[PDB]
Design a protein around this ligand. Structure first.
Ligand SMILES: O=S(=O)(O)CCN1CCN(CCS(=O)(=O)O)CC1
Ligand SMILES: O=S(=O)(O)CCN1CCN(CCS(=O)(=O)O)CC1
Ligand SMILES: O=S(=O)(O)CCN1CCN(CCS(=O)(=O)O)CC1
Ligand SMILES: *CC(=O)CC[C@H](N)C(=O)O
Lengths: 492, 500, 500, 492
């Protein structure tokens, strides 16, 4: 998911909409924008679909005000495509809205405590609604009005002591302003920027990625530190405060592999440069372990891997060729009467340039392997196009464990690498050869850009969850959620 | 514009819809699909928007039948977003529908003749409706039923003697089959493919590009020859015939530069290879002519120039780096009362990776320069991202003339290269250096993929029009069509706003 | 179905739209409006739904011009909700559009002739498209431009010799004007009105009913005579001509019973007065025949019978009371998995005021009895609301035959009165008593308003068809059309459900 | 506005939808349905438009559960067509939703107290949102779980002591059930019904009018008494409790004139019979004050007046004729480019049967006169149709004062009878004669059906507001609200 918040000195509706169109790759299932108007009331529009489809002229006219936040959703366990999207809202205390990218590992316990100690009802199964209600509950411990920046930071700190997981959040409190805060491990991405309108007026904004600041002409300031919170009043006054104990930087390594945009700088690291480095590492590993193989050309599987594969071909002294063309426009399959509903294809998303595989031993490069379904079909397409030997290299290491910090992954059972060695995975997908990036190499590829990061969040790769609260029981719990989300989406 | 026609043995709606999705890059303004159902009647669904938005389940349900044609629209003079989309239709003789990618240079005269001689009314300003009416009138000359293949070819031949310009068409005649034909100069693209089902049951298909055959699992057979017509009966039989007097192969060179998909083979030429060859040529030209220049990096302006720039970087022995990222998703700019700090037009399209320009003499590579407006903006974006020297190389030679064969290009006075030297253009766009592909190089780059083609359609580059009927009176008439088109689009916006 | 045509001197879109809203009671299935713009081209917007839903601002913007026609559809055999709505169109000769309320009894044969002789394809199963094609073919017989009024009338006359059945039509011919014409037997309704603007600048209009002229402030001139045609040129000139061999006035008697609006004057007969007269006749019949019965109150089954029942209550010297209220708003019944306790079909339509039936012998009055299903349900509703005796009186005589002139009625075997005595029908519907209007009384009731009409169209009542071409082969063919129509509507529902 | 609530033993979505289609005349601007699902979560759909347009198959599929409430909105001051419709919702305590027909005369003060004492934010300008928040606030004073019926009644009683005005309300509290309650003056309508499914299962429902019970096959039980509250648990157990001091019956007299359906029985009075009685009274007044006038026929102005006029013609021994036909289908007027936007007409809503006015002195009957605009045009139409003398009789007395109890009326300035005598009103609308029903006659017409009612709510007629808290200051306050609603709707 992706979030954006803008505390401006002029209408923000178009700007939030614009920031969301460049963060669209973070989620295309739903979008939402909520602003505070001249009357200190929230105006909201959120619905399923791409940003460009969710917000029509009439909704834009309603989104009045100089402060607002937005969200684009990537369906996850608990937040199915059929469920209410973000931002979520509460009317007490004061009126609070919040958008979130992440996941709370203790959501269920929090929901119990909210119900039993505060009588606060959670209407969805989204941990973002629960996150909003914990914060609201903490803000409700104040008598004096209005709240000082100290009370808002105190509430966020109290919140950080209750919730556990990963989270990049942005919220607005009526009559106060905008807050943004990050988990104590710095797992989910969040940057801060500003835009000077004149000598006395400066607008602020926070976004999941720096590209949202670039597209609007905002100057990059810095990443919001782990555990840090940012508060911008109504009036445009900026406050920042460390709101967690023992904060450390463990950025999600997955964002760098393919999730984030290449033009973003996350925690001082260029995603693009980190990706070129991955190709450098993978190229060196291939040149070492596959010295005797006959490889005629390196062909990336679009689109993230094109640069990675380019670097590999350079290292290997082999030609790089566009063997696969990604279909920019993909349509749906219709359930028609009498007609046989045939095949779920990768051919809908990808086309093979026939001339580029014919009688060649091809090294295909992909960003990662999850279910293994697509790679299987892609290798098949290479053979149909006349390829002799088909090898596959993965920019990311084996993905064996589920992500519980915000990135959507299927259950451990549906992960081809889970419980399997490289050769078996290779035989299943039917490749002549399979090679994965070493985790320590991925780490160095990214770390080389910012050596200050000591450790990243690498759970999908090594099964080590930094929050130390993940076990099979919890993962099974998450699966039951997916089962309920399925029944709901199936229904629609 | 892109066209597709499938004569199958099983339901074609999903397949036509899928073929259009991979031809979607030829026009995103409107889309249309028409089929012949089991009762020998047309079923149609066409409207503005992408294929994925135009056709919903309720529309697909009505598009029944085993034969059908499709079209995606790129708006051009005489066919604005506001006007009626293709495919077009007429009910006599027989019931005929047609889809066309191209442009008739004698549309006006044809419309007058149609009115005076046949009393056939043309409801839109689209020459594609006129083409259909000439075809329909020629088919009305037979007095025996059903028509024989020879009759249908005779009609296409009569049509070709009457019409002038460029065209790739696919049509359907109720009770007979699907026909496809191409102009006598092979200007517009059109290929034929097949899919065997069993002994003497093959499905046939025609499309603007081979990627449409690929995606549906059809075996590519060959390009429809210039002036040739193909005819596939409802019973699945194939017939073809040369329907032009002196057919020549003069493929539009523009398709190769950026309009078609790189994974397509147009007249035996791989679009991808041709573009790689375009990089080899432009890189050697730069090596020769810009030898004294220090360029630190080669940066493509996405998306067409990525491989071209890679090749250029390879010839120059300079690094290739992704400096610009094209925003895959662009939204609408709503006209709100007092839009305070508007987001820059260029930023809507692209985003610069600051790190890739800082303190660097950069060489940018774009597919072409038309108006020159966005070029000046991209150059500015690079200096803003920290570049020192900003050079611009264009994979296409100077674009100085309007295209009247189906590719939408502004008028001659709107083209920045028109009436200007390279150094004048350079000054206007603000580059430290500007270099264009030489036309003969572009020609060799594409021809290298198939030496049989000796002459390409180059009018936008050299002002030479093969139909030899392009004069100022005609150009001016096209400008008139464009102005009326604009009025119709402006009106449509007027109360879309007032309705609020 | 209802039609409207306005030949004005200022924009007609809003006016046509308003005229259809007051003709909306003649069909709520679909609606269509087409105009001729300043460039002599048609602009059209037609779709399923009420007028208020079909035409939005963006559609009205495109419907430019000072002349246009409109149509609202009631679905009938050959024209299901699924099929294409009116008005229909053809591009040759000239560009002709037409809207029709009625039915051609020789549609099949006409379609065959059109195919064989003219190679004119009919895309739908609507005889209105066929009618347009016969008209179009007759207009293709002239070799001088423009056509003279006399030519256009000659074509309508040729058409009338070819077609059989009932029809009220309004059409437009590009470059000439708007025409309107009525069948030789004056079966379907059609009136002419005008609106003066200044010296020699009058706007003309035709519509199915006079309430459409009223609402737009047009001066009612007169009914279009049977077999007559009206022609209004673009320049505002009026011409008329008798285009039938032996025109007779045989107005559909059904329009009077309940189909038309009470504030309309059809062939000099006020619909309202005729219905009041229908009450006078039925009340005197009841007084004479049900003299020994104790009836406490007269209760109409809304909405057509309110004034009829009032009149009946007046003749019987019994109180009139609103026992049933018709639910102005009816919703959709969604097909949900396991719809536990479904709301009764009759309750969706009506609601009973419990107080008005309790311990009372009630006399209910309905406009007619077709299938008899809803009648049995209303009777049940009354007993449930506490009635003791429940008698039913029908303003229309027994409905025993199908209508093939434009009014949608089920087949003969589906009509409860078909092959049954009044007492048998009574037993089936469960009334304590049942009484029908006598046909000669219904006739006198309407004729009293204009003694000049000596014969009405009564086929649904007496099986006598004026066109004398209605046999079982034809009836069976209509049943075939209805079945195919049902399949098309069923299919449309199938994935509307599956899409969920 | 109209409300409905159904506590059933099987899905209620279609039934609530159906009940709302027969209460559609109470408001056509927006509709909303909210149900509690098998998971104890609310599922909601509300939007502008008729019920048949607001609820599509997909929304119906989402509205799962055996308990739910609905609302159809009639735009009023504070709740413009552009504002969020009902039912409103709050997440604490427990989760509460509420639909309301009425108006709180002390809304502004309540909103201040809610903000200052509870930090509860009101996002709309609707007093129904404020009503919901007062109730929620009162329900929040409980420690033990779940709430007993006594606590729910205590909260409603505490609520009745704070709010003032008129209100017929229905709400649902998650994990508890459905509540319905009426103001202490019995101004707004509300009935209770039941449906026996079997020996052990009985469903309950409440609606603004009895027609909603009839259409669903529910048996009428009784009107909910003034100040009374009804509570139905989840489990189908019914509780009732008087929750106000000094409750009295002052039903809104206006509902009977034209607002309610004729087939409804409100407070034991048949609306239909009360209307026939109005014609009896008005007929007697005309026969007495207009003895010497030449009247040829009585013509009602559709549709409510047809019966009233029928009774008048009977009393007067004059013929009743359908001179006016109401156009059942009315369309909109389009703002087109270049075209002159002409006339706002009554001809769009009404057609004159020409033959029925020609050379006659006509007595037109209408249900009431507010702005006087339409009557003016109607009389004009009668003259155009050839009428000689045109007289007008109003079933209701002069409407001189604004209604602040739920019925939408324009400000006192826009009421033709405000500050004007009959003759002046007559000259303005251009009638040859004008006669209004006497208030005491209207009272007797309605009261004759149920003599137990001593006094009705008659404010629009006499300017006496039973809640004793209405003065010019307040009425001016209401006008500023209309001005803000206007700017909002104008905007859309
Ligand atoms: O943004 S807008 O105001 O336009 C739409 C508001 N949005 C509609 C959908 N519901 C959840 C439906 S249900 O889960 O309760 O059925 C959340 C609120
Ligand atoms: O006249 S035509 O039938 O060709 C035009 C018919 N039109 C498509 C409907
Ligand atoms: O904030 S604003 O005033 O701009 C919009 C108010 N908003 C409109 C949409 N509904 C839910 C739609 S549905 O869930 O009922 O479909 C919630 C209220
Ligand atoms: C409603 C009507 O008059 C039907 C017209 C014609 N028969 C048709 O199109 O079906």
């Amino acid at each position: 998911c992706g979030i954006v918040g803008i505390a401006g000195v002029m209408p923000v509706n178009q700007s939030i909409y614009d920031a969301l169109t460049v963060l669209q790759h973070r989620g295309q299932d739903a979008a939402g924008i909520i602003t505070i108007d001249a009357n200190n009331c929230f105006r909201l529009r959120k619905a399923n679909g791409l940003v460009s489809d969710v917000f029509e002229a009439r909704h834009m006219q309603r989104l009045q005000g100089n402060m607002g936040i937005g969200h684009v959703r990537y369906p996850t366990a608990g937040s199915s495509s059929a469920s209410e999207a973000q931002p979520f809202y509460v009317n007490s205390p004061y009126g609070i809205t919040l958008a979130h990218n992440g996941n709370l590992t203790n959501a269920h316990e929090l929901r119990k405590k909210l119900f039993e100690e505060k009588r606060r009802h959670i209407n969805t199964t989204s941990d973002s609604e629960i996150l909003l209600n914990i914060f609201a509950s903490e803000l409700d411990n104040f008598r004096h009005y209005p709240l000082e920046a100290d009370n808002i930071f105190a509430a966020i700190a109290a919140t950080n002591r209750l919730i556990r997981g990963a989270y990049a959040c942005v919220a607005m409190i009526i009559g106060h302003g905008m807050v943004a805060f990050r988990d104590p491990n710095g797992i989910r991405p969040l940057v801060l920027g500003k835009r000077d309108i004149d000598e006395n007026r400066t607008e602020y904004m926070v976004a999941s990625e720096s590209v949202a600041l670039d597209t609007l002409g905002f100057d990059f300031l810095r990443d919001v530190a782990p555990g840090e919170a940012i508060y911008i009043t109504e009036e445009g006054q900026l406050f920042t405060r460390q709101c967690a104990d023992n904060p450390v930087s463990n950025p999600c390594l997955f964002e760098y592999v393919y999730f984030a945009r290449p033009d973003s700088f996350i925690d001082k690291i260029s995603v693009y440069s980190a990706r070129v480095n991955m190709g450098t590492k993978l190229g060196e590993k291939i040149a070492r372990e596959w010295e005797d193989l006959d490889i005629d050309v390196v062909i990336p599987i679009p689109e993230t891997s094109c640069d990675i594969a380019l670097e590999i071909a350079r290292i290997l002294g082999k030609p790089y060729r566009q063997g696969f063309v990604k279909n920019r426009y993909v349509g749906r399959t219709f359930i028609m009467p009498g007609q046989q509903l045939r095949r779920k294809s990768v051919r809908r998303k990808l086309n093979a340039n026939r001339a580029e595989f014919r009688d060649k031993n091809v090294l295909l490069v992909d960003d990662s392997i999850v279910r293994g379904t697509t790679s299987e079909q892609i290798i098949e397409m290479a053979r149909e196009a006349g390829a002799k030997k088909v090898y596959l290299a993965s920019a990311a290491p084996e993905i064996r464990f589920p992500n519980v910090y915000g990135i959507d992954m299927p259950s451990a059972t549906e992960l081809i690498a889970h419980g399997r060695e490289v050769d078996e995975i290779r035989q299943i997908i039917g490749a002549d050869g399979l090679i994965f990036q070493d985790l320590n190499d991925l780490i160095d590829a990214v770390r080389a850009e910012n050596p200050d990061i000591q450790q990243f969040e690498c759970s999908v790769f090594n099964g080590v969850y930094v929050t130390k609260d993940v076990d099979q029981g919890y993962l099974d719990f998450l699966d039951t959620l997916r089962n309920d989300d399925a029944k709901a989406v199936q229904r629609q």
